[PDB]
Amino acid sequence: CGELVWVGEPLTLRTAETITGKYGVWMRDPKPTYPYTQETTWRIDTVGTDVRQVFEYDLISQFMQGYPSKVHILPRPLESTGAVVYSGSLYFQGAESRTVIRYELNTETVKAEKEIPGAGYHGQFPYSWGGYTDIDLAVDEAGLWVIYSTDEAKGAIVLSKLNPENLELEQTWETNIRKQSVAEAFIICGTLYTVSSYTSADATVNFAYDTGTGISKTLTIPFKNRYKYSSMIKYNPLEKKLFAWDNLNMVTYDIKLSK
């Protein structure tokens, strides 16, 4: 679980789109929990205002291969498609709010709701590609996180580790990078990494903040994005890959860590 040293070229995901026909924003659980398995996937369709539908699929279904097994109707709409599934629950930001909601998928139950203290929302502290990217939920090898900013932090990235059961903020770190200066961010092995553009063609993983030590540094790892679409990239620690949505396709990026 060392420092990132390389990011691969983006590879189009064809699996879920092939079996289902939907390009959709796809999510997988890095801690699959019975009765779900590694073949289970969830899609948020990105069409419409105040989206509440999450579609659940078994891609090796013995009953209805190709069609959703279940459609969940969330009790609050999504602020953005940047939700995560972790340990059997969907964690999402409620529209027009700084609230994170834990929705248990197999029981359709809200198990926790938490206001992220002081967090900006709805266009106050977006990433550099704009949109409602103020609050970014992330999963890594140690569980669930949230990436945000606050007025007191003057727009610098704040990072909190979340208790997945009750959404308490178990530890917080105020980092030394402005959120609006980077295009997206993700956590790998307890290090926050950010992506920046530095010309019209060229982007890099440009910064690292290690939550274990507090130490940060500039990086220059090439990051080959196809587009500049306001979204959140999500690390999947089970697959050890980054998953991104660009409005056309889901793509994965392979990673290498120093050994």
Residue numbers in the entry: 245 to 503
How did the manuscript describe this experimental structure?
Olfactomedins (OLFs), modular proteins containing an OLF domain that are predominantly expressed in neural tissues, are involved in fundamental processes of cell growth, cell signaling and cell adhesion. High-resolution crystal structures of the ∼30 kDa five-bladed β-propeller OLF domain are available for four subfamily members: olfactomedin-1, latrophilin, myocilin and gliomedin. While the folds are nearly indistinguishable [Fig. 1(a)], one difference is the presence or absence of a heptacoordinate calcium ion bound in the central internal solvent-filled cavity of the β-propeller [Fig. 1(b)]. To survey the OLF triads for calcium binding and to test whether calcium binding can be reverted by simultaneously altering Asn428 to an acidic Asp or Glu, we replaced the triad Asp–Asn–Asp with Asp–Glu–Ser, Asp–Asp–His and Asp–Glu–Lys via site-directed mutagenesis of Asn428 and Asp478.
For myoc-OLFN428E/D478K the difference upon the addition of calcium is within the error of DSF (±2°C), suggesting that myoc-OLFN428E/D478K cannot bind calcium; for myoc-OLFN428D/D478H a marginal stabilization was observed with calcium, suggesting weak if any calcium binding. Instead of not being visible (myoc-OLFD478S), or adopting a well ordered and helical loop at the top face (wild type), residues 260–265 are shifted ∼10 Å from the original top-face helical loop and are now in the approximate location of the myoc-OLFWT side helix. In turn, the residues previously forming the side helix (303–310) form an extended loop conformation. Finally, unlike myoc-OLFD478S, the loop composed of residues 291–295 is ordered, although shifted ∼3 Å from its defined position in myoc-OLFWT. In the central cavity, a salt bridge between Asp380 and Lys478 (2.6 Å) is observed, with the terminal N∊ atom occupying the position of the Na+ ion modeled in myoc-OLFWT. In addition, Lys478 is within hydrogen-bonding distance of the main-chain carbonyls of Gly326 and Leu381, and Asp380 forms a new hydrogen-bonding interaction with Tyr371 (2.7 Å). The position of Tyr371 appears to be shifted ∼0.6 Å compared with the wild type, but still forms a cation–π interaction with Lys423; both of these residues are conserved in Echinodermata OLFs with the Asp–Glu–Lys triad. Like Asn428 in myoc-OLFD478S, Glu428 is no longer in the central cavity and instead forms hydrogen bonds to water molecules present in a cavity between blades D and E. In myoc-OLFWT this cavity is largely hydrophobic, and is lined with Trp373, Val439, Phe467 and Ile477. Overall, OLF domains harboring the Asp–Glu–Lys triad do not appear to be capable of metal-ion binding in the central pore.
